[PDB]
Design a protein around this ligand. Structure first.
Ligand SMILES: [Zn+2]
Lengths: 193, 140, 115, 301, 73, 73
């Protein structure tokens, strides 16, 4: 398609294509056309158009643009919240976020180096895919296929995993906290009290 | 404390939050046990490991706080600032947030009328897209 | 004679070690650990309507770094207990959710809020 | 696009024509032809446009030959990366690093050597893989010289265990590398790996290893209140002394500011000499050492 | 132990020229007495040897040599 | 029931399988006439599996010596 004719259709692959699409996406006409479809429509197509209208209108009313879907800069947790604390015995204690951030940084550096020198499309595409997988594992490790097992004994903790579940922050360090000025001991019966 | 407004974090916002840029995967040198430069744990971006103590030896006192030594760039202040300050990583090629995609259609939303298989095959580099066509030019 | 002796079970704590990633007291007896105030405990306290006891049991007695030194100082000096601040775990939560590309902004009714 | 991205990478390698001798020597011939073409194009001297376009075309053909060779040996690197997997680096990451090494080898390979490409490549593939393993495998980065020292120590220690059938003593170990026992201990200690906080504590669900270790930065309330009481008592005791005496001793010991001022530095704002200040400071020390203003401060140490 | 050793057939390369035979396994008395291991923090183990035989059709020779695989708890 | 013998045997078996894989790799990457049973076999997997069993495993449980009956049970 490229060779036989060019300067007419623009194509791409990966998240860059999605960013280009959302940049030029015109949600107002989509909302209008979906309203028209809802006015005269039947079947499950009506429900699909309903969901599409819900999200498109939610984005239209809000001032934030849809391009926030495709992030460009990954934030990094403050170091004290992912402590590499010294441990007695010459050993070390690290959080899995350290490993995940290291992975994304390594892959970003290699991606940059591959782009500096003239490199093939296959290797650079696979490298970009590795970066995508690294970022996805950083935010949510275990949401696609096998998780990033790290040491191999257990899946690594992820940014979302710290914000979810029985052991997550919400239900373990905000609604139920430990407290000073307290005690515990077995109970006996005192009838003279 | 009146309202916790939440929303999509654009690239400009993440840049604004960041006090620097993370360029290396280094954490701590194996001998001096101190955070490295421009990597993870770097004091030039996150904060001083010790109270009012910079990295290069120049300032070790509480008297002259709130200053930036030109040697290593660490801004002398309380060590608690490391818990608050955060950095960012500039990706050479953009990626997609795993949360909004790969899920129920209330978060993905069908914002682009493509099936989840298409997205899975496109964002992970297994198929192409036609981002734009000069259809009027082609017809002309 | 069972091994559930009272000597092993007896534990108490005015103030002791604290955890690192989150500044709440750590658990256990060997490390002077405060007892946990679970979710059902806060539910039961809400059922009484006791809001102030809850406010101290969540802020002054844990999870607030600026408040603990101040309350110990006030108790020792006899001064009345000071106003609790914001907790640390909430700050950890907002910093974490800021790290998922969610600009969680704390705002006031009249523009930006003071914290 | 599926799970386990290495499988999709393997399919992406797909079916490509493996190169026999004459095929690859012809490819290298047109590679150097394109190299000379782009070299001629790079010169500032004027070349008429048609020959320049022909030079660019042969250079593009050389680039296509380059890509053919790269895809041909992608298979080679995957085997080589597998040769090194399981050492803290993900297999696909090792594969990509091997791809980088192969790119280097191709850029530095030519038919002037009377040998196949597969023999010359593996050296550089192993070079890149081992460099990346040293520089990116461990959480605490270890310099490459230190990585080779530790791995040499490890392997010779395994060899000693194999021969003697017992754990080698540190002294026999030290003489083997010819370094001192001190270096042996340092290298043994420098070769560890961090243990993750987010690991089971041993019980079913009793949190994880990150909530059983106390921090050191936490201000102990007992110490803080004791220090505040010390500050108050010290300030009151100084107020007991005369105004000038209290001021000069406080400046000499920075009770108002974190930097104490030495004697002559006290003798500028107060208008007294470097020695007058010395004598009155000594008298203040003598007065404070009196049993009167010492009973309260003794308990504070 | 002998069953698991015999289950492992001699390794054959792609040429099938070479082979390793693990015929017999044997023990030696433990070096550390039970109270000694308990006191000084040692695992109560004993050595376990096995005779490995090297045979190659190309060489047409058999080489026998005992090997030691570590301490057995 | 997988008595203690069978559990330890399974761990020895996986260790010996890893050993077999390693020695097969070595044959694929070694020259003839320089191959002897002593040098080829790598004992790290067997020892590191039988040591990773007795520590960090559910079945190898800490003895409770509260009394002889507790030990028996
Ligand atoms: Zn400095």
């Amino acid at each position: 398609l490229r060779d036989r004719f060019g300067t007419y259709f623009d194509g791409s692959m990966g998240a860059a294509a999605l960013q280009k699409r959302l940049e030029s996406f015109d949600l107002d006409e989509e909302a209008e056309r979906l309203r028209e479809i809802i006015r005269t429509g039947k079947g499950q197509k009506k429900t699909r158009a309903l969901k599409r209208l819900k999200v498109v209108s939610a984005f239209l009313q809000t001032s934030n643009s849809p391009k926030g879907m495709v992030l460009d800069c990954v934030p990094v947790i403050p170091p004290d919240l992912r402590p590499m604390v010294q441990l007695d015995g010459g050993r070390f204690a690290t959080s899995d976020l350290n490993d995940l951030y290291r992975r994304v940084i390594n892959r970003n550096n290699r991606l940059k180096r591959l782009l500096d020198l003239g490199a093939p499309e296959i290797i650079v595409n696979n490298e970009k895919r590795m970066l995508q997988e690294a970022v996805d594992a950083l935010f949510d490790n275990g949401r696609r296929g096998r998780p990033v097992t790290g040491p191999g004994n257990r899946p690594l903790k992820s940014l979302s995993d710290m914000l979810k579940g029985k052991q997550g922050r919400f239900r373990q360090n905000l609604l139920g906290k430990r407290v000073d000025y307290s005690a515990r001991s077995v109970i006996v019966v005192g009838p003279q009290l | 404390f009146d309202e916790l407004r939440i929303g999509l974090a654009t690239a400009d916002d993440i840049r604004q939050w960041s006090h620097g840029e993370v360029k290396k995967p280094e954490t701590i040198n194996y001998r001096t046990l101190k955070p490295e430069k421009d990597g993870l744990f770097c004091e030039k971006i996150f904060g001083p490991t010790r109270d009012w103590e910079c990295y290069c030896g120049k300032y070790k006192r509480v008297r002259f706080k709130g200053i930036i030594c030109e040697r290593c760039g660490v801004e002398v202040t309380r060590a608690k600032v490391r818990r608050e300050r955060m950095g960012h990583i500039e990706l050479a090629a953009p990626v997609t947030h795993i949360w909004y995609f790969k899920g129920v259609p209330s978060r993905l939303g069908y914002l682009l009328d493509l099936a989840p298989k298409d997205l899975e095959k496109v964002i992970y580099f297994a198929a192409y897209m036609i981002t734009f066509v000069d259809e009027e030019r082609r017809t002309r | 004679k069972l091994h559930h002796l009272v000597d092993d079970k007896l534990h108490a704590r005015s103030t002791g070690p604290y955890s690192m990633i989150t500044q709440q007291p750590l658990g256990g007896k060997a490390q002077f650990g405060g007892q946990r105030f679970g979710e059902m405990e806060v539910w039961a306290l809400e059922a009484y309507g006791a809001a102030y006891a809850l406010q101290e049991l969540l802020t002054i007695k844990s999870d607030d770094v600026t408040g603990r030194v101040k309350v110990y100082e006030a108790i020792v000096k006899g001064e009345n207990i000071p106003e609790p601040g914001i907790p640390e775990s909430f700050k950890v939560l907002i910093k974490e959710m800021q790290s998922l590309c969610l600009n969680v902004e704390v705002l006031s009714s009249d523009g930006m809020s003071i914290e | 696009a599926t799970a386990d991205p290495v499988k999709d990478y393997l399919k992406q390698i797909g079916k490509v024509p493996l190169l026999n001798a004459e095929q690859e020597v012809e490819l290298a011939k047109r590679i150097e032809a394109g190299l000379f073409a782009e070299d001629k194009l790079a010169n500032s001297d004027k070349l008429a446009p048609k020959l320049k376009r022909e030079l660019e075309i042969i250079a593009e053909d050389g680039r296509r030959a380059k890509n053919h060779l790269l895809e041909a040996n992608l298979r080679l690197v995957v085997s080589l990366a597998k040769r090194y997997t399981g050492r803290g680096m993900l297999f696909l990451d090792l594969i990509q690093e091997g791809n980088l090494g192969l790119i280097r080898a191709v850029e530095k390979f030519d038919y002037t050597k009377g040998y196949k490409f597969s023999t010359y490549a593996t050296w550089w593939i192993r070079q890149a893989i081992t460099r990346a393993m040293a520089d990116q495998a461990r959480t605490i980065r270890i310099p490459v010289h230190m990585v080779e020292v530790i791995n040499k120590l490890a392997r010779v220690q395994r060899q000693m265990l194999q021969d003697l059938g017992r754990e080698p003593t540190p002294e026999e170990l030290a003489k083997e590398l010819d370094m001192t026992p001190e270096k042996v201990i340092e290298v043994q200690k420098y070769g560890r790996e961090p243990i993750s906080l987010h690991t089971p504590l041993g019980e079913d669900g009793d949190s994880e290893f990150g909530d059983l270790i106390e921090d050191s930065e936490a201000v102990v309330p007992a110490d803080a209140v004791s220090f505040t009481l010390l500050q108050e008592q010290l300030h009151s005791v100084l107020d007991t002394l005369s105004e000038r005496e209290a001021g000069v001793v406080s400046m000499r010991f920075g009770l108002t500011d974190g930097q104490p001022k030495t004697l002559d530095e006290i003798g500028k704002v107060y208008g007294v000499t470097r020695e007058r200040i010395r004598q009155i400071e000594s008298k203040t020390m003598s007065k404070l050492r009196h049993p009167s203003r010492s009973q309260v401060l003794r308990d504070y140490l | 132990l002998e069953e698991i050793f015999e289950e492992i057939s001699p390794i054959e390369d792609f040429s099938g020229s070479m082979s390793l035979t693990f015929r017999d396994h044997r023990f030696e008395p433990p070096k550390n007495s039970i109270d000694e291991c308990k006191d000084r923090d040692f695992t109560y183990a004993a050595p376990l040897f096995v005779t490995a035989e090297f045979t190659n059709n190309e060489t047409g020779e058999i080489k026998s040599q005992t090997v030691f695989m570590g301490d057995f708890p | 029931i997988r008595n203690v013998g069978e559990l330890i045997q399974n761990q020895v078996r996986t260790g010996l399988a890893r050993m077999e894989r390693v020695v097969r790799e070595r044959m694929t990457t070694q020259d003839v006439e320089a191959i002897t049973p002593q040098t080829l076999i790598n004992i790290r997997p067997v020892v590191a599996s039988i040591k990773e069993f007795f520590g960090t495993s559910q079945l190898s449980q800490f003895m409770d010596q509260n009394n002889p009956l507790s030990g028996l049970t």
